[PDB]
Amino acid sequence: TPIFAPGENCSPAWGAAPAAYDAADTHLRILGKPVMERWETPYMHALAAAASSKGGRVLEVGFGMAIAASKVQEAPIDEHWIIECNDGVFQRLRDWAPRQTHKVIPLKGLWEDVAPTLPDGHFDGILYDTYPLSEETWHTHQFNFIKNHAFRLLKPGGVLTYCNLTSWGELMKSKYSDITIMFEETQVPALLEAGFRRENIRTEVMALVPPADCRYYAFPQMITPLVTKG
Ligand SMILES: Nc1ncnc2c1ncn2[C@@H]1O[C@H](CSCC[C@H](N)C(=O)O)[C@@H](O)[C@H]1O
């Protein structure tokens, strides 16, 4: 069964949907979707290192299991802004934020609603890792954020990192056997359209074998984008 059915739209229901964190604290499911899993930890650490590489003000979109967020907090940053839609996940963010070393700025809502309220050229780093909220935005939800907000929000020299594992897992099953080719063909044109220059786009590949029973990702490598504003 596909994660999304034809014409499925979960966006208006995401906020009020109960957040299901299992007792073993290894997964997060919302509306029966596999939103986050702890096997992703080394990869979440690579994204966190990329978004926090310039220090200063870091914007993180999607809180999930706080894996990337706890790694961002290990870097010498000044502010950690976090946008989260789901009420259940936001309560976990609310409990996590006080004990953190670097000031956390928690904001509740869809980035579609919250990001327009954020100041232009204010962030040294951006980490985008949400989840598709509709079948037709399965491979493209990150592009809407990158085009409308990532470029304007970054300071000159600022770094954007992001991922979309539901998309990339699928594209690595049939269409591609080389993860850098997959990135070049499916991601680079939208980033160029967003205002980023090709010479300012790099990628880091890392070895990570997912579990055998993982339906949404099977490729034994992960790709970390580093998209710098000119
Ligand atoms: N449009 C949107 N705006 C804000 N948050 C969203 C969103 N769509 C999904 N979310 C939230 O995005 C998150 C994706 S899971 C993120 C996992 C995180 N990188 C970690 O390391 O633990 C979830 O908390 C989900 O509720």
Side-chain angles (χ1 to χ4, degrees):
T1 188
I3 289 148
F4 280 94
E8 188 179 351
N9 183 8
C10 301
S11 185
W14 203 265
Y21 289 94
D22 67 330
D25 202 32
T26 58
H27 78 59
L28 163 62
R29 294 177 82 89
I30 302 168
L31 298 161
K33 311 277 192 261
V35 177
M36 190 46 189
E37 296 180 357
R38 202 167 285 276
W39 69 260
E40 292 184 30
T41 295
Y43 181 51
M44 293 298 108
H45 289 174
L47 300 172
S52 65
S53 64
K54 298 289 292 184
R57 297 185 195 96
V58 173
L59 170 65
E60 188 172 344
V61 192
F63 184 70
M65 291 180 76
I67 301 159
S70 300
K71 186 70 189 189
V72 164
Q73 282 289 325
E74 291 190 11
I77 59 150
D78 301 331
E79 287 168 40
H80 192 181
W81 291 54
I82 309 177
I83 302 170
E84 175 57 52
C85 171
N86 182 271
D87 293 344
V89 183
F90 192 77
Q91 187 50 55
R92 296 244 173 175
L93 167 58
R94 267 194 70 208
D95 298 340
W96 174 93
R99 25 184 195 91
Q100 305 315 306
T101 304
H102 310 281
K103 282 181 175 66
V104 177
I105 302 91
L107 299 171
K108 190 190 101 177
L110 289 165
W111 61 255
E112 293 88 328
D113 295 321
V114 179
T117 75
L118 266 51
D120 283 20
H122 200 63
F123 299 96
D124 296 273
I126 299 173
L127 201 167
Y128 182 90
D129 181 26
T130 65
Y131 202 75
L133 297 187
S134 66
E135 194 273 339
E136 59 272 19
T137 65
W138 175 260
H139 303 289
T140 65
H141 75 92
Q142 69 271 26
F143 303 144
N144 297 316
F145 172 84
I146 297 162
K147 289 186 251 179
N148 300 307
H149 304 291
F151 192 77
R152 59 167 280 264
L153 291 172
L154 286 171
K155 280 185 180 180
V159 49
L160 162 78
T161 195
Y162 73 95
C163 69
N164 181 342
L165 293 195
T166 55
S167 177
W168 303 350
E170 186 77 19
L171 292 158
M172 289 326 294
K173 276 166 193 273
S174 63
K175 303 275 106 183
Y176 300 94
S177 71
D178 186 296
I179 202 165
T180 60
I181 299 291
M182 179 280 160
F183 195 86
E184 197 69 27
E185 296 195 359
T186 73
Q187 309 296 303
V188 170
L191 302 164
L192 298 178
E193 211 173 336
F196 298 98
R197 295 191 303 270
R198 188 61 194 87
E199 62 266 24
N200 290 333
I201 301 159
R202 295 113 52 230
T203 64
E204 285 176 3
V205 168
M206 63 163 295
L208 184 60
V209 180
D213 62 65
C214 179
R215 57 146 154 193
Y216 64 97
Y217 207 96
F219 206 70
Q221 290 174 336
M222 312 307 298
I223 193 157
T224 300
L226 294 101
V227 183
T228 301
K229 191 182 178 173

